[PDB]
Design a protein around this ligand. Structure first.
Ligand SMILES: *C(=O)N1C[C@H](NOS(=O)(=O)O)CC[C@H]1C(N)=O
Length: 260
């Protein structure tokens, strides 16, 4: 279609590989670009880990208040919030918010441990019908984003469907579905990605990711005005391992998708 033609031209001008999945929750239509190809998730995978802990909290009703120790051996490559609480503790709610709103990797590793390793995160995806998501490693080696490597990858089509079930659907419980929505709405890392390509009036919750090979990702649930919400996944990766981030590609892909 016409939007397919604009995303392809955007991909060609970028010199990279672009994967886009849009779900319009009015007629359940889908616009896809390389929607069945695998992309390195990087820290967009933190939504699955946080949602998995939220699913646990449905049965363990005070799980999110459990304190977790932050130790110097726990710090990894990017620890904005966890660095402020070394030799102290953070609750699982605080670690989830830090993981999704500041992309703290030490917090991610705490969520993975709560679920019993990366295989516990993958388990949750399978439990909600995501047959594609796979988490094989912890922070930070899950961000190697090597071409052809299926580790820690997913397809745009599967993440869009999963992100819909987690936020708009009821893959989670009522209080949990609302908590994840509030967390995504208060992200601080995404002003230059999907948000930058959408109208100011649109309310958006998102989770960004980045890694080697210039990988630049963002997944977002979008609430327009008087309109049925949309779900958009934008994944991008490049041929050079040392390639720089291209958040502008994500902004332009969201601009094209949102009629423009
Ligand atoms: C996620 O991909 N990452 C965590 C952190 N912030 O990136 S994000 O705001 O696009 O999610 C640093 C880069 C990256 C990583 N190396 O883990």
């Amino acid at each position: 279609s016409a939007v397919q033609q604009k995303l392809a031209a955007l991909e060609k001008s970028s010199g990279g590989r672009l994967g886009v999945a849009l779900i319009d929750t009015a007629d359940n239509t889908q616009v896809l670009y390389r929607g069945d190809e695998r992309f390195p998730m990087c820290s967009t995978s933190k939504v699955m880990a946080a949602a998995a802990v939220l699913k646990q909290s449905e049965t363990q009703k005070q799980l999110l208040n459990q304190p977790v120790e932050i130790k110097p051996a726990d710090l990894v490559n990017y620890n904005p919030i966890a660095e402020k609480h070394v030799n102290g503790t953070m609750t699982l709610a605080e670690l989830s918010a830090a993981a999704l709103q500041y992309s703290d990797n030490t917090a991610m590793n705490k969520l993975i441990a709560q679920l019993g390793g990366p295989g516990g995160v993958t388990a949750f995806a399978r439990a909600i019908g995501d047959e594609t998501f796979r988490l094989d490693r912890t922070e930070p080696t899950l961000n190697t984003a090597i071409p052809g490597d299926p580790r820690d990858t997913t397809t745009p089509r599967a993440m869009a469907q999963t992100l819909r079930q987690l936020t708009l659907g009821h893959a989670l419980g009522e209080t949990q579905r609302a908590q994840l929505v509030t967390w995504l709405k208060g992200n601080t890392t995404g002003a230059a990605s999907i948000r930058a390509g959408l109208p100011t009036s649109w309310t958006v919750g998102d989770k960004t990711g980045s890694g080697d090979y210039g990988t630049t990702n963002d997944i977002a649930v979008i609430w327009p005005q008087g309109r049925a919400p949309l779900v958009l996944v934008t994944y991008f990766t490049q041929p050079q391992q040392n390639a720089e981030s291209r958040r502008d590609v994500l902004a332009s892909a969201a601009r094209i998708i949102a009629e423009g």
